[PDB]
Design a protein around this motif. Structure first.
Motif, short mmCIF file in Angstrom:
data_model
loop_
_atom_site.label_atom_id
_atom_site.label_comp_id
_atom_site.label_asym_id
_atom_site.label_seq_id
_atom_site.Cartn_x
_atom_site.Cartn_y
_atom_site.Cartn_z
N UNK A 1 -23.59 14.33 -48.53
CA UNK A 1 -23.77 13.36 -49.64
C UNK A 1 -25.20 13.48 -50.19
N UNK A 2 -26.03 12.51 -49.93
CA UNK A 2 -27.44 12.57 -50.43
C UNK A 2 -28.39 13.06 -49.33
N UNK A 3 -27.91 13.23 -48.12
CA UNK A 3 -28.80 13.71 -47.02
C UNK A 3 -29.27 15.14 -47.32
N UNK A 15 -28.62 4.87 -52.00
CA UNK A 15 -28.65 3.53 -51.33
C UNK A 15 -28.36 3.70 -49.83
N UNK A 16 -29.27 3.29 -48.99
CA UNK A 16 -29.07 3.44 -47.52
C UNK A 16 -29.92 4.59 -46.98
N UNK A 21 -40.99 11.00 -42.71
CA UNK A 21 -42.27 11.77 -42.77
C UNK A 21 -42.15 13.10 -42.00
N UNK A 22 -41.04 13.35 -41.35
CA UNK A 22 -40.89 14.63 -40.58
C UNK A 22 -40.58 15.79 -41.54
N UNK A 26 -34.46 12.47 -47.77
CA UNK A 26 -33.69 11.19 -47.66
C UNK A 26 -32.81 11.22 -46.40
N UNK A 27 -33.03 10.30 -45.49
CA UNK A 27 -32.21 10.27 -44.24
C UNK A 27 -31.51 8.92 -44.10
N UNK A 28 -30.49 8.88 -43.30
CA UNK A 28 -29.73 7.61 -43.09
C UNK A 28 -30.60 6.59 -42.35
N UNK A 29 -30.73 5.41 -42.90
CA UNK A 29 -31.57 4.36 -42.24
C UNK A 29 -30.93 3.92 -40.91
N UNK A 30 -31.62 4.14 -39.82
CA UNK A 30 -31.06 3.74 -38.49
C UNK A 30 -31.89 2.61 -37.89
N UNK A 31 -31.44 1.39 -38.10
CA UNK A 31 -32.16 0.21 -37.56
C UNK A 31 -31.94 0.10 -36.05
#
Length: 32
Positions: A1-3, A15-16, A21-22, A26-31
């Motif tokens: 997708x957007x990754x 969105x998401x 910084x690595x 754009x990476x998936x936000x992992x809370x």
């Protein structure tokens, strides 16, 4: 997708997705 999209400060990931910084992309936000 957007990754895989590269970003720096105000690139605009999907969105998401956040700018890591690595590989600077754009990476998936992992809370925890």
């Amino acid at each position: 997708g957007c990754l895989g999209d590269k970003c720096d400060y105000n690139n605009g990931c999907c969105s998401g997705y956040v700018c890591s910084r690595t590989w600077k992309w754009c990476v998936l936000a992992g809370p925890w």
